[PDB]
Amino acid sequence: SSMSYSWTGALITPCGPEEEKLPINPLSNSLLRYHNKVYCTTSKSASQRAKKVTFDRTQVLDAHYDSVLKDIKLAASKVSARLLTLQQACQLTPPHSARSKYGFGAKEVRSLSGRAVNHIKSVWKDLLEDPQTPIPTTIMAKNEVFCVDPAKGGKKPARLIVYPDLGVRVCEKMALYDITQKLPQAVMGASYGFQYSPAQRVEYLLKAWAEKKDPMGFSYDTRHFDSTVTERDIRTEESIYQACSLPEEARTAIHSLTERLYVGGPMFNSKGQTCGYRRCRASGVLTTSMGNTITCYVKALAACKAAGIVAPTMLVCGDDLIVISESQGTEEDERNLRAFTEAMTRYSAPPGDPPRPEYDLELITSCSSNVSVALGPRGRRRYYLTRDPTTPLARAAWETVRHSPINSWLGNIIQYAPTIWVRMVLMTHFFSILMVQDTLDQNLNFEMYGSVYSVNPLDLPAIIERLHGLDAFSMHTYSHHELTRVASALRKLGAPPLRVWKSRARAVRASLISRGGKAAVCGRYLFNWAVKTKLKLTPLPEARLLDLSSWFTV
Ligand SMILES: Cc1cc2nc3c(=O)[nH]c(=O)nc-3n(C[C@H](O)[C@H](O)[C@H](O)COP(=O)(O)OP(=O)(O)OC[C@H]3O[C@@H](n4cnc5c(N)ncnc54)[C@H](O)[C@@H]3O)c2cc1C
Numbered sequence: 001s002s003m004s005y006s007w008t009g010a011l012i013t014p015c016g017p018e019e020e021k022l023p024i025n026p027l028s029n030s031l032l033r034y035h036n037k038v039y040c041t042t043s044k045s046a047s048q049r050a051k052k053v054t055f056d057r058t059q060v061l062d063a064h065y066d067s068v069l070k071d072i073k074l075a076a077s078k079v080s081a082r083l084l085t086l087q088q089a090c091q092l093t094p095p096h097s098a099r100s101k102y103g104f105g106a107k108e109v110r111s112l113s114g115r116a117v118n119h120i121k122s123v124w125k126d127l128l129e130d131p132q133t134p135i136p137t138t139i140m141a142k143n144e145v146f147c148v149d150p151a152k153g154g155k156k157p158a159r160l161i162v163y164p165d166l167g168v169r170v171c172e173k174m175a176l177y178d179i180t181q182k183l184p185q186a187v188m189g190a191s192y193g194f195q196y197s198p199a200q201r202v203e204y205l206l207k208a209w210a211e212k213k214d215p216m217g218f219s220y221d222t223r224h225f226d227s228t229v230t231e232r233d234i235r236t237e238e239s240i241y242q243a244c245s246l247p248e249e250a251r252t253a254i255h256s257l258t259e260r261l262y263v264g265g266p267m268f269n270s271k272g273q274t275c276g277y278r279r280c281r282a283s284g285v286l287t288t289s290m291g292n293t294i295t296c297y298v299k300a301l302a303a304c305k306a307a308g309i310v311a312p313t314m315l316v317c318g319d320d321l322i323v324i325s326e327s328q329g330t331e332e333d334e335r336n337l338r339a340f341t342e343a344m345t346r347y348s349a350p351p352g353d354p355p356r357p358e359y360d361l362e363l364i365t366s367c368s369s370n371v372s373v374a375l376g377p378r379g380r381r382r383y384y385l386t387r388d389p390t391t392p393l394a395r396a397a398w399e400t401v402r403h404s405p406i407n408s409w410l411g412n413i414i415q416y417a418p419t420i421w422v423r424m425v426l427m428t429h430f431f432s433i434l435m436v437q438d439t440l441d442q443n444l445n446f447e448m449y450g451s452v453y454s455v456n457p458l459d460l461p462a463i464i465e466r467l468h469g470l471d472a473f474s475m476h477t478y479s480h481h482e483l484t485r486v487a488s489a490l491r492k493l494g495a496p497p498l499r500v501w502k503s504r505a506r507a508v509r510a511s512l513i514s515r516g517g518k519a520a521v522c523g524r525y526l527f528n529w530a531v532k533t534k535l536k537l538t539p540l541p542e543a544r545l546l547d548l549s550s551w552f553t554v
């Protein structure tokens with residue numbers, strides 16, 4: 001039926017500058033050596049990304065989907081949501097969020113400057129009163145940093161980002177913000193993924209695998225998900241929102257937003273030229289993650305009914321998906337996943353990689369992360385969440401005039417603290433730099449789902465214990481997979497081997513303990529793995545005092 005995009009063929013122009021790599025990346029050139037392999041996407045590769053995401057889509061709904069949708073709209077019916085006040089909505093604007101054509105910006109919006117408050121009042125009135133005219137959107141390349149893959153044809157092209165004006169975005173929060181904070185949890189329950197700390201996520205997969213008598217899991221990511229959301233998906237989700245107990249002013253605005261923005265609108269490049277028209281999900285609206293994750297839930301859950309996936313347990317993070325279910329022999333299980341894929345493709349959510357039933361939890365990957373196991377001193381199996389370190393390393397090497405990679409180092413040390421690569425590579429380089437910089441106690445930002453939290457480098461031991469527990473400073477024997485992947489990435493990036501890092505880590509332990517105080521606790525804990533004779537670490541009193549709830553939620 002419907003064509004995802006159409007293109008006037010104007011360029012997808014960049015937004016401001018696109019910083020270049022420098023001839024010395026002086027923070028990360030003691031980390032890895034092949035700074036050529038570390039590249040950043042760019043509006044140049046936008047034309048190529050355009051060509052891969054455009055295609056006529058044909059959706060084929062059936063009674064499994066119809067059944068599922070109703071059980072979800074009934075789950076949504078249990079919801080009460082409230083409008084956000086124009087001012088609440090305003091103060092949710094991120095401090096550096098892209099400014100408005102009408103000369104004002106995140107600065108003024110969060111300050112409740114009267115100029116903006118007015119123009120946003122006039123936006124929201126026109127939202128309620130006119131429920132048809134399209135809302136112009138801006139399309140721009142997305143810039144993000146990757147390592148090259150010569151197997152994947154070199155350098156990825158830049159993901160497309162489409163978003164409305166800054167005044168608009170605040171009204172989406174007035175109409176919809178409250179729903180984003182409740183509906184995914186009300187519809188899916190524990191199937192909802194973005195509520196779990198890494199350890200909590202691991203506990204869930206473990207709980208699920210254990211309660212099958214013969215489990216079988218697989219993962220599913222949809223190829224170019226933002227472009228396979230059809231106009232009927234986006235309206236079907238508006239009727240999921242409308243299932244909720246809402247005030248009448250909200251429903252009007254919601255409906256107007258769906259008709260005028262969400263189901264599609266003309267896209268403008270940064271120079272203003274009409275760039276094309278969009279008939280799919282704009283990645284950039286408030287509902288981008290709620291909408292993906294819920295649309296994904298039904299499609300995948302209906303396709304589950306359609307394949308005869310037995311006793312399925314689901315974990316949905318955006319378009320990524322894990323399904324630990326009941327096995328029907330290796331022979332039938334294979335057959336079902338084809339039915340799954342076919343069903344999904346019939347729903348306009350075709351995969352990039354054909355799913356495959358797996359029977360070993362380490363071999364199942366989704367959300368770029370997998371589970372894994374290590375022994376401790378106790379000879380006892382401890383499970384953790386790890387991932388391919390090739391990209392986190394690459395982003396640890398992004399140094400330009402304008403961006404310093406250290407926040408990224410924090411982010412990883414926090415998120416994948418138990419990993420052999422964080423413990424032995426990142427943590428080593430982190431403190432090694434901070435101490436020489438003599439900024440070991442200057443605060444750092446840790447970013448996650450758009451929230452930023454203030455984090456001080458010397459608190460890392462108690463933070464990591466509240467999130468991962470003391471077992472994180474005692475991982476004895478890593479899996480043969482992890483050992484191979486970590487080795488493999490260090491080679492691929494010209495970083496020194498893990499043997500080397502053990503020598504350098506010994507040193508950082510010395511200076512850290514020799515600074516005493518908090519620095520010394522970082523030594524004895526974060527680098528206990530490094531020493532011939534391990535100190536018996538005990539709980540930290542600070543750990544019990546920490547509130548890390550909203551970190552890994554939404
Ligand atoms: C609602 C939401 C908002 C986010 N906002 C920001 C932000 O403003 N600035 C920033 O630097 N990072 C943002 N992120 C990414 C976030 O910081 C983490 O990196 C995120 O958990 C992805 O982890 P990952 O790279 O291992 O998953 P991935 O390997 O990237 O797999 C993709 C899955 O994770 C989600 N995801 C990954 N990257 C993003 C992204 N930029 N935006 C939205 N979803 C993403 C997708 O929903 C998808 O389900 C956001 C993530 C979510 C889910």
Ligand SMILES: Nc1ccn([C@@H]2O[C@H](COP(=O)(O)OP(=O)(O)O)[C@@H](O)[C@H]2O)c(=O)n1
Binds near residue numbers: 221226284288318
């Ligand atoms: N940096 C990012 C990455 C993904 N996303 C969204 O989350 C979805 C995840 O899809 P993905 O990461 O597997 O890549 P695609 O399949 O969309 O090409 C995207 O379609 C986008 O809608 C985003 O909004 N910002």
Ligand SMILES: [Mn+2]
Binds near residue numbers: 221223224
């Ligand atoms: Mn995808």
Ligand SMILES: [Mn+2]
Binds near residue numbers: 318319320
């Ligand atoms: Mn994905």
